[PDB]
Ligand binder design. Structure first.
Ligand SMILES: Nc1nc2c(ncn2[C@@H]2O[C@H](COP(=O)(O)OP(=O)(O)O)[C@@H](O)[C@H]2O)c(=O)[nH]1
Ligand SMILES: [Mg+2]
Length: 392
């Protein structure tokens, strides 16, 4: 049987990408060319990330049901919730957006000390929606963890107003101050604004993330969640059934999840102004994995170079597939040899023009290398189209 499930894509303290598993999930014909919403939940271990993500799964499987949260005797399944890495759900959901788009929705469960910092940075660079899962309060160490993204963001915006990151959500579990800061998004926004306010008393490097974080991220928001009740907290025989979950937690959970994942809420991954497809997103995985196998985290310039690389190679992948799709429409009857070449040269130049037309990072000399990679991979496709045409 075929069934969707969680797939380990990221695993000495070295980190390995499972390319075949990634390609199998994101390069399938149904989703490869769809623009992608990459949803991540990240943060410290044992704070309820997988639990949350399993309720997200219930919503993505029945977005239009008023009762998506589930039967109250229905056990909670999906990502295991009771080792360091990133799991993705093998069903890449195709959701109608109100504008007529079908977008692909990828869910990543990001489990993590330098190892957890690496997993947190990797998931944030890949994501378009990052749910920063925190327990009870937001503390200065929590803010500190974002400093490298701000410094990356400063270099990235030296010459454009386009922000490198999309949505970051501070999700504070087991919230402790529900009088002044109500459960939900509005109290969250009220708290986050106060917490993010610049104060002379904070260490200089933490004033820096406060000063700069909003300029790096398209949307910063904060949602305060109540404690889920004693059974969800303590019991070993607890299997996730809603009837054993505090009812104020359920009510706010039902607001949170469409707030993050409803069709109007799905933020498409975009870099340097261009929306990213599932095919393209694989290139960001492969480029970022290269710089996350050193002693410490990469420097901002190293992260910017990886974005530029992925940005160019996603352009190669698009142009190549465009040539490849149209070529197969011709080559599958039999085409006369010089006819096949005219059409090949016409089609290869079109994909060259497409590649050139993309706003790519790094500059002309940087991208000329990837132009020539594209042409070489097109020539390779063409040589094999002649040997299948000559068998006709
Ligand atoms: N205190 C508390 N525990 C929770 C909450 N949500 C889930 N849990 C419990 O936390 C335990 C481990 O959760 P898990 O999803 O594996 O956390 P993860 O490691 O961050 O993915 C389970 O017993 C859950 O029932 C919450 O909001 N507060
Ligand atoms: Mg987890």
């Amino acid at each position: 049987v075929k069934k969707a499930g969680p797939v380990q894509v990221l695993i000495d303290h070295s980190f390995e990408l499972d390319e075949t598993a990634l390609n199998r999930i994101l390069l399938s014909e149904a989703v490869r060319d769809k623009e992608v919403v990459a949803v991540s939940v990240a943060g410290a271990f044992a704070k309820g990330k997988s639990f949350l993500m399993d309720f997200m799964l219930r919503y993505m499987y029945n977005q239009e049901s008023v009762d998506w949260v589930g039967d109250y005797n229905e056990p909670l399944t999906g990502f295991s919730w009771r080792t360091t890495g990133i799991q993705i759900w093998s069903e890449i959901f195709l959701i109608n957006k109100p504008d007529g788009k079908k977008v692909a929705v990828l869910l990543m469960d990001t489990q993590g000390l330098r190892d957890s910092a690496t997993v947190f940075a990797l998931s944030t660079m890949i994501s378009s929606i990052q749910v920063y899962n925190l327990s009870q309060n937001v503390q200065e160490d929590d803010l500190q963890h974002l400093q490298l993204f701000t410094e990356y963001g400063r270099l990235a915006m030296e010459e454009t107003f386009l922000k490198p990151f999309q949505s970051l959500i501070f999700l504070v579990r087991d919230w402790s101050f529900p009088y002044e800061f109500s459960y939900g998004a509005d109290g969250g926004a009220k708290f986050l604004e106060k917490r993010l306010k610049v104060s002379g008393n904070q260490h200089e490097e933490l004033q820096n993330v406060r000063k700069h974080i909003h300029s790096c991220f398209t949307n910063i928001s904060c949602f305060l969640l109540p404690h889920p009740g004693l059974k969800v907290a303590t019991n070993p025989n607890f299997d996730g059934k809603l009837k054993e979950i505090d009812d104020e937690f359920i009510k706010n959970l039902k607001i949170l999840i469409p707030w993050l994942l409803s069709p109007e809420s799905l933020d498409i991954k975009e870099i340097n102004g261009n929306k990213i497809t599932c095919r393209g997103l694989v290139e960001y995985f492969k480029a970022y994995i290269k710089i996350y196998q050193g002693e410490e985290l990469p420097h901002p310039k190293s992260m910017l170079q990886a974005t530029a690389e992925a940005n160019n190679l996603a352009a190669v992948a698009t142009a190549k597939d465009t040539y490849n799709k149209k070529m197969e429409e011709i080559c599958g009857p039999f085409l006369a040899p010089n006819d096949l070449q005219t059409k090949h040269l016409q089609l290869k130049e079109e994909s060259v023009k497409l590649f050139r037309g993309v706003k790519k990072m790094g500059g002309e000399e940087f991208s000329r290398r990837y132009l020539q990679q594209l042409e070489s991979e097109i020539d390779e496709l063409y040589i094999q189209y002649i040997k299948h045409n000559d068998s006709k």
